[PDB]
Amino acid sequence: GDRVADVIESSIGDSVSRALTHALPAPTGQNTQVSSHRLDTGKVPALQAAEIGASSNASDESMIETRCVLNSHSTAETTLDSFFSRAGLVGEIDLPLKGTTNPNGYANWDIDITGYAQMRRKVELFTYMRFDAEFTFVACTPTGEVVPQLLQYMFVPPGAPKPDSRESLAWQTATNPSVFVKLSDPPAQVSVPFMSPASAYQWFYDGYPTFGEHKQEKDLEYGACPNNMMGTFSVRTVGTSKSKYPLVVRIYMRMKHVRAWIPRPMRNQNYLFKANPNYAGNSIKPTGASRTAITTL
Amino acid sequence: GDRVADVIESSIGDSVSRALTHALPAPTGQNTQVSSHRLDTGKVPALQAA
Amino acid sequence: SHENSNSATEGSTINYTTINYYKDSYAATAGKQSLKQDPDKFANPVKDIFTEMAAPLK
Amino acid sequence: SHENSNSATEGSTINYTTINYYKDSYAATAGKQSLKQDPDKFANPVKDIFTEMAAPLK
Amino acid sequence: SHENSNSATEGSTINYTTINYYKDSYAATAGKQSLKQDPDKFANPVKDIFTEMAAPLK
Amino acid sequence: SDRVAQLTIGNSTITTQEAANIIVGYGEWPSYCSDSDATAVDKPTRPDVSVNRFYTLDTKLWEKSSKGWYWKFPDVLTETGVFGQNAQFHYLYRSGFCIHVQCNASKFHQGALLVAVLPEYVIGTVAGGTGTEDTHPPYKQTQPGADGFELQHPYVLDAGIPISQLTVCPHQWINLRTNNCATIIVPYINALPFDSALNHCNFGLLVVPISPLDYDQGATPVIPITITLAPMCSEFAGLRQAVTQ
Ligand SMILES: CCO/N=C/c1ccc(OCCCCCN2CCN(c3ccncc3)C2=O)cc1
C-alpha cells in the first residue's frame, strides 16, 4: 500500500504512449476549394518559420485565387505493399563444372539481400521493416538453356548443420524444409514468414553484437545484428556423381504484408559492400545533375 | 444557368459600394465631459502613429 | 477461414482483404490495404500547433 | 467482388457482365456490352428537327 | 463429408481441422491440432501432491 | 508566448527567451514499457528524479569553417551521474530523451544550424578513398562518448546518405536571427522493448551548420554550442555487477 503524496500523484509506470497525431482516411488526393482575394492585416498564411521543424501549412487556396477541383486521383499505388510487393533479384548462385568457386556440385548462400542495389536502396528508405515474403527460384545454364536436371534447395536455419558436399548427410532434410524441382519445371516458389527474434528486421544497427573490448580486429562486427541473420539457403544437384551441366540459380524476393518504421535519407553514393554503408571517399558525387550558374538553366 | 462553383460563389457584379463610415447629425459643437486623473499602464491616448 | 494467424500484419491498424488456400495466413496474397495516412507525424510534429493564418512565432 | 475499380470502362453509360480472378478489374474479360445506340448524334445533328413527311426546307 | 473414418487419429482426445478430396480420411492433410498439454503426467506423477510453499518431505 | 519557455525536470530547470516551439519526435511522448510489449520477467527499477534530469555534457565552438558534429545516445551519458551507474549495473535499459541544444549570438551575427535526431545512425568509412578497402570505423568513432565527433564529409553524413534529406527526421534549426536553441523530445526507438545501453546506440544527434557563421571584425568571435539532455521514463532491468563495455 501507498501513502506519501508524491507516490500517489506519480506518473511512473504510464504505459500508454500519448500520440499527438492520428491517421485519417485518404483514398484520393485532396480537392481544391474556390478561394477569392483577401486583403487583410493580421492574417498571413504565406509567412512561415522553418526553424520550428514543421513543413509549411500554406495551401493553394490562400496563395492564389483558385477554382473548385474535385480530385479523384487514387493514393493506392503508394502504399507500402504496392511499392514493395514486386519481385526483384536479391541473390545469385553459381554451380559450375570445372571452376574456382563451387566445383563440387553444391553451394551455400548466406541469406542477405543487400548484394543488389535496386532492391537494397528501396528497403533502406526505412529503418525497421516487418514482412512476409514470396521467394522464387529461377534456374538455367549460363546461356539461359533448360536442361533435364534435378535440384534440391534446402533452408538451413542458424544452428542446423550446413552441407559441406553434394553428398552431405544433412540433405536427409528430416526437419529443415527442402524443395526438389527440375530445371525444366516452372520456377520453384514458396512463402516465407517473418522469422526474426525481434519485432522487425532493421537495415541499420548502430552498435555491436557482444560485450567486451571493441578492438581493431573485431571492428568487422560493428553494425552486425543477429536478428537480421535468418540462415543459409543451400542448393545441390541431386546425385552422387558430378552433374553434366553448369547451373545458375537466380533468387527473387517479393515482400508482402509489409509494415515499416522510421524513414531515412535515401542512398546517394554507390554501394561497395553488403555489410556496411561504406562509400568511396575519392568519388563523393553530388546527389544530382549540376549546372554552370545559378542564374541560367 | 450557372453550375461551376467559382461562378456561383463569385462577387463579380456587386454594385453596392460598401462604406466604412456614415454621417451623424451635428448641429452644434461637441460638448466636454468631466474627466479626472488617470495613472494607468496599457492605456495610452496621447501616443499615435501618423 | 479456420487458419493460423501467423501473417506479419496480424493485429495491424489497417485491415487487408486477401486470398489463401493454406492453413498458414502468411501464405496469403498481399491483397488491398486500407488507405489511411498520417502526414503530421513527420511533417508537423510540434507540441503547440499553430494556424495557417497566424504568424508561426509570437 | 471486393476488387479495385480500375477497368477502363469504370463509370460508363453501358453496363458490362464480366469474369475475373484478380484484385484489379482491368484484368477481367471483355464480357457482354449493353446494346444501346444513338445514330442521330452523327446522322441527324440538326438544331431544329424536321419530319419525314415534311419538306426539309421551307 | 460422407467418408470412411480410417484416419490414424479417429477417436482421439484432440480434434483436428483438415482437408481431403478422397473417400478415405487418412488421405487428409495433417491440419491444425488442439493445443492441450499435460506436463504433470511426466513431471509430477506423485500420489500425494505437495505444495510449492511446503517442505516436500515432512 | 512560443518564443519563451521553461523546461523543468528533476532538480533542473532550463529557460529560453528565443525558442521556436518544441518538436515531439514522430508525434509521440516517451512512455514506460507496457506489460504486453515487455518480455523480461524481473521487476524493473525506475529511479525517477535521480536519473531523469538535465545533464549538460559538452560545448563546441562554432567557427566559420566548422563542419558539424554528432553524439550517440545513450552513449553520451553512460559514464555520468546516477543514470550512468544504472546503465552500467544493468543489462537492460530503455528511456526517452529531451534534447536542448543551445547557441546564442547577437543581432549582428548570422548562420543556421540544423539539429536533428537520426535513429540507428550507422557510421561508414571512405573505404581507403578508392573504395577497394573494406575499412571499418573504430570504437572511438562509433561511440564517441560525451565529446562527440566531428563529421569528415557532412554532405553524405559520413554514411553515404544526403544531409539534404535529414529533415525527414525530427529536427529544428537554430537560425541566429530567430532563435537561440532547439528542443526535441524523443520517445524510445527500437525493435525490442529494452536493450543494452552499452552495445547499442538508439540514435545519433547531429548538429551541422548549413548556413555558415559570419560576423564583422569586432563582434564576439567565440560562439559556443552547448548540449544539454535529459532521460525520460528511464527503466532498467537485469541487475548484476557494473560493466563499462
Ligand atoms: C525449401 C527452402 O525454401 N526456403 C527458401 C527461403 C527463402 C528465404 C528465406 O528467408 C528469407 C529472409 C529474408 C530476410 C532478408 N533480410 C532481413 C534483414 N536483412 C538484413 C541484411 C543485411 N543487413 C541488415 C538486415 C536481410 O537481408 C528462408 C527460406
TrEMBL record, chain A:
This chain's protein is named: Genome polyprotein
Q: Which organism is it from?
A: Human enterovirus 71 (EV71)
Family (UniProt) = Belongs to the picornaviruses polyprotein family.
Function noted in UniProt: Capsid protein VP0: Component of immature procapsids, which is cleaved into capsid proteins VP4 and VP2 after maturation. Allows the capsid to remain inactive before the maturation step.
How is the subunit organization of this protein annotated in UniProt? Capsid protein VP1: Interacts with capsid protein VP0, and capsid protein VP3 to form heterotrimeric protomers. Five protomers subsequently associate to form pentamers which serve as building blocks for the capsid. Interacts with capsid protein VP2, capsid protein VP3 and capsid protein VP4 following cleavage of capsid protein VP0. Homodimer. Interacts with host GBF1. Interacts (via GOLD domain) with host ACBD3 (via GOLD domain); this interaction allows the formation of a viral protein 3A/ACBD3 heterotetramer with a 2:2 stoichiometry, which will stimulate the recruitment of host PI4KB in order to synthesize PI4P at the viral RNA replication sites.
Q: Where in the cell is it found?
A: Host cytoplasmic vesicle membrane; Host nucleus; Virion
Automatic annotation (TrEMBL), chain B:
Cell compartments where the protein resides: Host cytoplasmic vesicle membrane; Host nucleus; Virion
- Complete protein: which residues are present? 566 to 615 of 2193
The entry sums up its family as follows: Belongs to the picornaviruses polyprotein family.
As recorded in UniProt, coiled-coil segments are none
> Could you tell me what this protein is called?
Genome polyprotein
Subunit structure of this chain's protein: Capsid protein VP1: Interacts with capsid protein VP0, and capsid protein VP3 to form heterotrimeric protomers. Five protomers subsequently associate to form pentamers which serve as building blocks for the capsid. Interacts with capsid protein VP2, capsid protein VP3 and capsid protein VP4 following cleavage of capsid protein VP0. Homodimer. Interacts with host GBF1. Interacts (via GOLD domain) with host ACBD3 (via GOLD domain); this interaction allows the formation of a viral protein 3A/ACBD3 heterotetramer with a 2:2 stoichiometry, which will stimulate the recruitment of host PI4KB in order to synthesize PI4P at the viral RNA replication sites.
Q: What does this protein do?
A: Capsid protein VP0: Component of immature procapsids, which is cleaved into capsid proteins VP4 and VP2 after maturation. Allows the capsid to remain inactive before the maturation step. Capsid protein VP4: Lies on the inner surface of the capsid shell. After binding to the host receptor, the capsid undergoes conformational changes. Capsid protein VP4 is released, Capsid protein VP1 N-terminus is externalized, and together, they shape a pore in the host membrane through which the viral genome is translocated into the host cell cytoplasm.
Taxonomic source organism: Human enterovirus 71 (EV71)
